[PDB]
Write a protein that binds this ligand. Structure first.
Ligand code: SF4
Ligand code: F3S
Length: 106
């Protein structure tokens, strides 16, 4: 499965949903996750993320391992998103800021 990590929070460009062939993304107020069981590992969404926040599970940085289980957990309770939307209001301000997990909204 592929996993959405920290830099997506407060950015949520959603440029990753249009190329997904199986619509396995689920959205929160300021973050998006990939459902591990529905994801077919096509890797097509990874280069589409301006925040470079997507990684295949085996490539998730050591300091962001928590996002693997987090994607699995939130994909179970959040609504499905299959269409591209406008990025969050101040996405550019937050793109690159570290430790944004502290700002994650349920
Ligand atoms: S790797 Fe492919 S199937 Fe998985 S979330 Fe990305 S675009 Fe969708
Ligand atoms: S910022 Fe998030 S919404 Fe998709 S394009 Fe990147 S994983």
């Amino acid at each position: 499965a592929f996993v959405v990590t920290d830099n997506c929070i407060k950015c949520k460009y959603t440029d990753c949903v249009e190329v997904c062939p199986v619509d396995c993304h689920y959205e929160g107020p300021n973050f998006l996750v990939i459902h591990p069981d529905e994801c077919i590992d096509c890797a097509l969404c990874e280069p589409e993320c301006p925040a470079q926040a997507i990684f295949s599970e085996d490539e998730v940085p050591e300091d962001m391992q928590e996002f693997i289980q987090l994607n699995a957990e939130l994909a179970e309770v959040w609504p499905n998103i299959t269409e591209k939307k406008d990025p969050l209001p101040d996405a550019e301000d937050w793109d690159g800021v570290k430790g944004k997990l502290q700002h994650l909204e349920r």
